[PDB]
Design a protein around this ligand. Structure first.
Ligand code: HEM
Ligand SMILES: Nc1cccc(-c2cccc(-c3c(-c4ccc(O)cc4)n[nH]c3N)c2)c1
Length: 394
């Protein structure tokens, strides 16, 4: 006898398991067991992934409900799960989204300056260089301090919460609450700080004293800061890191983008499509009985939307494992999700990766792994797949 298929399949972010395609073909929605011991429906075809994400009766918010089958333990107060919903209800959606666009004056130039400075330091220190800890993550951290309007020097301390904050754990994590409460107090202080007048926290600080928002809770304002910094930094840092691996593994693509940097946005869009940075499917709780393919999902059941299931589906992306810069449907991937909860930072995430890659290829046209690919150490039981270190030479 064998046990119910367990998720996740592999923490490796440099290859998709052959098992995913077998699953998609044979049973594109099927029962699995999560690390908590809960049962869930794993959805792995583009068609069924999109169906689930575009049907709000598959609820993000209700995944936080007491007694629900869980993908993993909450690392935040249950209300944070519905953060964007709470932002919307508070009338803050337009202002928040405006604050996190890459279109603010000097933002892209800041990204370029920061990336080039990071790379110059690596070149000065000499190979090997760690492109995660000393390039991608610092670039993400610097970007989000700028976007939030908080001091650059506060970034590192907020950043070191993230190795625990975005754990994918069977059980609650005591350190997560310690760091969360600390970071909330930091952000509360930021809102009271007269020096903070720019970025997301600068705008929230003003809206907080605007009579149109007098009954929005201080809790929510601080929570937006911590949530957006954390989610933004972990998502952009992790995506860029694993994108760089995919690029480095493709010298022909590396050279092409180096020679024709105008193709970098199309390249990044394909790197988004084949990205394995999300370690788990996106969780949703059914709030009704809903037919998904051959399965009638019952109210109260957990559904997991496997992004690489959708994004490597050959019925939507022919030759899915290949990076093709001239696809007819290039942005139709699910790297930023789909529907009600589509990533509000998608444009910023794109620009972070584009500018990071553009700068790297200019500074280090000969960039290559400095260790055999199998020697990368893949972080386990985490909401992202990332190598602990990414050693390169050039
Ligand atoms: C390459 C970078 C990024 C990737 C791949 C990414 C991916 C995603 C995905 C897949 C979702 C959907 C989650 C779900 O439906 O369960 C999402 C939502 C979200 N993202 Fe991102 N994201 C990125 C960058 C960012 C940035 C830069 C920010 C903020 C500064 C951000 C903030 C958020 C927030 C607040 C949500 C929740 C949306 C909602 O619930 O309505 N993300 N992201
Ligand atoms: N960019 C991106 C991608 C995926 C999710 C999010 C996002 C956006 C908003 C909330 C959440 C979220 C958390 C969470 C975990 C650790 C934290 O430090 C903050 C939040 N727990 N459960 C959910 N729902 C997640 C953002």
């Amino acid at each position: 006898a064998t046990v119910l298929l367990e998720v996740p399949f592999s923490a490796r972010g440099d290859r998709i398991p052959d098992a995913v395609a077998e699953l998609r073909t044979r049973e594109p929605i099927r029962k699995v067991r999560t690390i908590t011991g809960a049962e869930a429906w794993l959805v792995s075809s583009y068609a069924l992934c999109t169906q689930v994400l575009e049907d709000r009766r598959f609820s993000m918010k209700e995944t936080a409900a007491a007694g629900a089958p869980r993908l993993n333990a909450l690392t935040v107060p249950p209300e944070v799960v519905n953060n964007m919903g709470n932002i919307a209800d508070a009338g803050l959606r337009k202002a928040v989204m405006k604050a996190i666009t890459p279109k603010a004056p000097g933002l892209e130039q800041f990204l370029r300056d920061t990336a080039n400075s990071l790379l110059d330091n690596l070149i000065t220190e000499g190979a090997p260089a760690d492109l995660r800890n000393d390039f991608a993550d610092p670039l993400a951290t610097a970007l989000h301090c700028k976007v939030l309007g908080i001091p650059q020097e506060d970034g590192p301390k907020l950043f070191r919460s993230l190795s625990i904050a975005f754990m994918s754990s069977a059980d609650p994590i005591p350190a997560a609450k310690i760091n969360w409460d600390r970071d909330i107090e930091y952000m509360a202080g930021i809102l009271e700080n007269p020096n903070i007048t720019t970025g997301l926290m600068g705008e929230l600080s003003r809206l907080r004293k605007d009579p149109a928002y007098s009954h929005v809770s201080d809790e929510l304002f601080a929570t937006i800061g911590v949530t957006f910094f954390g989610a933004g930094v972990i998502s952009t840092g992790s995506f860029l890191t694993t994108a760089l691996i995919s690029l480095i593994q493709r010298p022909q693509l590396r050279n092409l983008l180096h020679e024709k940097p105008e193709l970098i946005p199309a390249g990044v869009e394909e790197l988004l499509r084949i990205n394995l940075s999300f370690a788990d499917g996106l969780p949703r709780l059914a709030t009704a009985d809903i037919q998904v393919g051959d399965v009638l999902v019952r109210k109260g059941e957990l559904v997991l939307v496997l992004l690489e299931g959708a994004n490597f589906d050959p019925e939507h992306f022919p030759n899915p494992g290949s990076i093709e810069l001239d696809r007819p449907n290039p942005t139709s991937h699910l790297a930023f999700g789909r529907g009600q909860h589509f990533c509000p930072g998608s444009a910023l995430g794109r620009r972070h990766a584009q500018i990071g890659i553009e700068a790297l290829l200019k500074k280090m046209p000969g960039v290559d792994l400095a260790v055999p690919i199998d020697q990368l150490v893949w972080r386990t039981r985490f909401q992202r797949r990332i190598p602990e270190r990414l050693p390169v030479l050039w």
